Design an enzyme around this catalytic site. Structure first.
Site: not given
Ligand code: MG
Lengths: 313, 314
Positions: A8, A12, A106, A188, A274
């Site tokens: 959230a 969100g 992503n 991407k 990431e």
């Protein structure tokens, strides 16, 4: 529709408010205690296009979910990749065989975590072009326009994907069904699976990397590996245009002089990257599909080596 | 009396030249250093050889001077560094016939692939020299201590002539031996040098720091597997477990763990070009011709070359 929003944060909260206003049953799940307390005490307060909107939405932390919670038709996943499995394990009591997930994360491969909780045919992926800002716990700033593009990942999920579009339409979210979303995410990830890791390891900016005589072979070898894995998932990357797209970033009048986001995380800020959800994901998929992805494998290992060397957290 | 050309007349080539000359062989020196050529032509090649002055009036030529009026030789001893080997052998072709053998004494891997362009592949020998030699000035060398040369024919047809070279070297006092482990030791050494060198250079860390990483085992074993896969095609069977065990032992901070490998000193300390083309680059070149995948070697080679460019290495 009964909808749970897993995460959230700003996006969100936007989605929650708008879906609530559209007449849906919305439950928020979030990991920020102050945020939860604020929403429980005062409702979710949105500065929504210059107008104050207060929404009294139920919110839970993941540890509070149990058998007593209501079941949902749709979970919108916004939780970052490294907390996704833990989030979904917690909200399991809310999931039935008929529950769909719209993954708005992503990066690549999230369906491998999600399929432990929900049939594969029940997984949708999306891209949102809406913006949103958190001003503090329980308070969001919502400005501008936007849209959501979504796609079923499995052909059996088409009918429900269209039903989510209709729900989102009536909520003002400007949705469309797109046959291009999985392709755009793959494309991407290609961009993020080259410059990110390579600038991070070599320590240089985008234009400096682009100027290396080895840049063409490194980038193209990596694109080919992404493409070989994507092909197994019936996504057919245009490798020449992906390369042209990357080559354009080298322009010093563009973003040439910038360092990629992975460089910023690790080299500048000593934070974990990431990489597990970019080259690491292509590697993981290559292993399951019997596709060789050695440049992704080695780059992933080198970045993990570098993280440990710099004491990244 | 063998006719022998020394390709690269530096300190080591000069040692071999003098000693083979003393053994009664017909020696010619080939060298790229003008001052060295001039000094040797004036005064002969002068050695301070175990405290005694020895002078050897040997013919010496630059590579560009060599033509079909030069003598054709039985043996060429290769000591020219890898970066100049191809141009050196192209230039000395007029001295090569179908019966000419080459003994490659260079450090590193895969030089036979350059040499075979100029010398029949069956006539290539490889060796390791344990002798020492110093250069005092142009045309002047200092020779102390003991040593040996181990050598091996690469092709099974080269065995008889390899034995003949051993005999020649024996009489010249070079302490030669035939060894069927020469090719293996070179591959094993390149394997060791094909791991920590590029890896510590790219990651910027020392040996023990690298070793402790949770990805060290995977990086090192994959690279070892690539070396072994290609060596296998040339009938060299690397003990992959022994090689890994050796590499792990280098992690010990009581040993060399706290040191940085030579490639790191070259590039990261000194901004000098690395030897990567003759280590990982050589496995990669061979793999391409043998249809063997060597992607970690290929990527590591490209990354190192990338870093060289970024640092302006020379
Ligand atoms: Mg550590």
């Amino acid at each position: 529709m009964k909808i749970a929003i897993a995460g959230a944060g700003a996006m969100g909260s936007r989605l929650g408010i708008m879906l609530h206003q559209g007449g849906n049953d919305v439950t928020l799940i979030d990991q920020w205690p102050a945020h939860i307390e604020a929403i429980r005490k005062n409702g979710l307060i949105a500065d929504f296009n210059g107008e104050e909107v207060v929404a009294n939405l139920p919110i839970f932390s993941p540890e509070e979910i149990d058998h007593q919670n209501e079941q949902v038709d749709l979970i919108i996943a916004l939780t970052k990749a490294q907390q996704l499995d833990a989030m979904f394990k917690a909200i399991q009591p809310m999931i039935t065989e008929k529950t769909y997930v719209l993954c708005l994360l992503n990066g690549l491969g999230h369906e491998d975590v999600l399929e432990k909780y929900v049939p594969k045919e029940n997984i949708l992926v999306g891209i949102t072009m809406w913006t949103a800002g958190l001003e503090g716990p329980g308070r969001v700033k919502l400005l501008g326009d936007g849209e959501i593009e979504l796609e079923n990942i499995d052909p059996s999920g088409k009918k429900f994907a269209l039903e989510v579009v209709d729900v989102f339409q009536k909520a003002g979210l400007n949705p469309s069904y797109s046959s291009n979303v999985r392709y755009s995410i793959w494309r991407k990830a290609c961009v993020n699976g080259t410059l990110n890791g390579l600038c991070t390891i070599l320590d240089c900016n985008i234009a400096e990397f682009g100027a290396l005589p080895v840049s063409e072979s490194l980038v193209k070898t990596l694109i080919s590996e992404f493409a070989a894995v994507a092909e197994k998932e019936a996504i057919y990357l245009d490798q020449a245009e992906v390369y042209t797209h990357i080559v354009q970033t080298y322009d010093p009048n563009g973003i040439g002089l910038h360092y990629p986001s992975m460089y910023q995380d690790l080299i500048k800020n000593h934070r974990l990257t990431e990489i597990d959800y970019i080259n690491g994901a292509v590697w993981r998929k290559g292993q399951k599909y019997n596709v060789a992805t050695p440049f992704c494998a080695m780059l992933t290992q080198l970045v993990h080596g570098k993280e440990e060397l710099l004491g990244a957290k």
